[PDB]
Amino acid sequence: LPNEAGRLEIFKIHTAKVKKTGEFDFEAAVKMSDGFNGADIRNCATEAGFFAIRDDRDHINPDDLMKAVRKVAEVKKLEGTIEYQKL
Amino acid sequence: APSHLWDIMGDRQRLGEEHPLQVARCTKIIKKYVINLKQIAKFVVGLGERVSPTDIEEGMRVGVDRSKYNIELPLPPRIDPSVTMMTVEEKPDVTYSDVGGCKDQIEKLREVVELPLLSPERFATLGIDPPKGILLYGPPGTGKTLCARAVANRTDATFIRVIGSELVQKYVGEGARMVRELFEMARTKKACIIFFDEIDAVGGARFDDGAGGDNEVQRTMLELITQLDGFDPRGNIKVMFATNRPNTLDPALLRPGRIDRKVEFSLPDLEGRANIFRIHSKSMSVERGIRWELISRLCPNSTGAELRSVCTEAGMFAIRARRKVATEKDFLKAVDKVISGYKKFSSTSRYMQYN
Amino acid sequence: KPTETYSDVGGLDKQIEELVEAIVLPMKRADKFKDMGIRAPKGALMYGPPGTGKTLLARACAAQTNATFLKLAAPQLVQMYIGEGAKLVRDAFALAKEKAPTIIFIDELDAIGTKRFDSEKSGDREVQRTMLELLNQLDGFSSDDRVKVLAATNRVDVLDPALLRSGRLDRKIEFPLPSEDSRAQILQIHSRKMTTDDDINWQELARSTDEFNGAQLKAVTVEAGMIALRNGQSSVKHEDFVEGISEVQARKSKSVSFYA
Amino acid sequence: DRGVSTFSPEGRLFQVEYSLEAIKLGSTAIGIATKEGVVLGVEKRATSPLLESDSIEKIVEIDRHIGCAMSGLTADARSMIEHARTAAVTHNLYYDEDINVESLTQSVCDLALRFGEGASGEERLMSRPFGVALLIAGHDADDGYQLFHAEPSGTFYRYNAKAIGSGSEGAQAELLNEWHSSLTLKEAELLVLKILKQVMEEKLDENNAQLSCITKQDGFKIYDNEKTAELIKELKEKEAAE
Lengths: 87, 355, 260, 242
Prior knowledge:
Chain B: Keywords: ATP-binding, Cytoplasm, Nucleotide-binding, Nucleus, Phosphoprotein, Proteasome. Chain A has four helices and no strands. Chain A is an all-alpha fold.
């Protein structure tokens, strides 16, 4: 799992080609999801598109982006905690 | 004997080349027919002389000529099933009246199985759905299969006998094929009966850990459930699940959507056990003036297997005790023999219920 | 396309709107996702008690799309011939090439998967082969968001933790037991083909039904017709529904001690 | 383990639930509670003519006005009998009055409803759940004659007519019809011997059958072999006319 600084570079990657607003969040997305996933961010990019359809907006609400990250916490529930694969 | 009644036709249907066709299955239909040989070889052909364009279908064995490939006659699909071809019987033994006594087990099964087959227009007035499956488990020794064969006699149709150990094969994944072989003949032969025997060896939830090699058993029911209720609710004939271990089965197996009518056999009471000796009184030898209601009262609650053993053993005392026919004295000796003598095992008597 | 639509179901709209956002909206709104660059969900996970309408709800969504449907069962992926099951998943998405807007359905997702390394028997490996195809094909030329697969399974307890990814299954749709108003609309639809006196109030029967799934509700109308059939009744009254629901099952008829 | 510490996922228990099997395999004990006093009887089940039936007793006298019918394992029941005699006398120590039979049965169950060894806040006299059940009868000045059933698992119940042992299920159906509130003392004694003889395979005599009664005047009286045989002869006269 990347560190706090490693995840920050990935959010800009998924939000690059995707049309966003200049208020798009920077460092708060890392603090929203801690220990639930911390691996696959692309799930958050898919969930953020559904909140903008209900509000009839092409651009994504920066607050809805944080809501999509919070939704992922209950999406997985697959356990899969790996402390044993180090060696 | 009919030696010359055949070879007369041997100069037409035999000397000429028609029948020796290579059996193969068609894959894609372009309306060009792509057909794969049993030798693993693919080709394309057209129609035949007598071949109709609507006869050839996808996923069906189509015989083609060995020299110049062409479609001549269609063949029935699923030539691979073998063992299931022996599961079809005819004219069973146990009749409808062979079940001792008239109880709720008989009346509930005939309405959900025999009634829609004999009178399909009775339930069509109200526009309802007859129960597809049933439930018969009960304790062993009660004649569970004796009541199931009473329904097959009134039906006068194809009876499919399925053993719980038949689903598990000697190859991994073959058990999924054995399930589709049972439901394929349901569409081919309409209004038939399939019967499962001892599903406990397959049906159940074993969870995960503790074995590591037992995952082959749970994959059979997951295919059986899909073939029963899938994405497409395909079904016609009634389904009967029977086993002696209801508690160890799949907790989802007892849920609605497959089994609707639930009938559990119970220990016959004094009135129930009385008719057991009466239906057996027509056989063997019964002395005039003997009341079987007193014999059944001395016998406590037990399975029906020990009840029929009383009349059978009663005839055995006449040989050793030097008796002509079966008397009341030999009936009391059977109470101390069939019951009191066998009290060491040889019985359930509330043994296997949950654990 | 199947014959099932959304009109034959009721009270499940909470779970239906979750299905509309999977294989329904991203298909018609794909023109919006291409301009916004947002990738549609590759699939949706479906679990719950086996007696739910997961088979019916997934069937009602396939007819509204009016697209080519493919049904693939997970236990069918295991055969005695090695590689035949691996070609099933490989050829399943091959039909998603010639016809791009298709729908693939996988029943009993828990049927294919396991770990089986440490403990005895050294596992099996006649199963996980076709499981690796599900991981490789969805990471291959697929995942164009025309390949969306409906994953239907029973529980969440036994599954491969690697089956969930933003490129395989996104929305996890829970199917709990229907509520009071949800069971009232389900029971009313199954009784539309019956003959009654129109004196039945389903609001009282909805509260008579305590935590029943979609299959346990359908058995109510089945037994209700059998009661009036054996008694020679011309119509099914309200008392036949109450009598049909009541049955032992459960813990009833206790030979156990204590109580008191 | 599957013991008292292991609770079954289905909402039940293992060791104590199986204890009803020892009750169903016990000797037949039949009793009837009427307004003229309770008539109790059991089956001593002589297994050989060399067995002395006067030494063994399945009916034990707890009090002059209160007595029980022991059907089951004698070992597990004798520990409750010693506590029943102690509790009945202990109540006379702080009171010196006729105690309620339900109160005495509850005091016996107070020790009989607790099992195990390790306990944080209380001592454990017992140890394992007992598979024996008794029928407690008596008389008081409030509700009159009462007949109970001693269950080590749950709370006892007041039964007017109760049958336990091997003939429990057989004699239970007969107690739902022939029983009536107007049954006299003579009709109650003849009805117990008639039902006990049917559920018993062997012959009916004073050796395998012992009965007792609880009244107000004579208290608890044990029928000897001479009077028990006379009651059997009275049953033969009734069966001859029927």
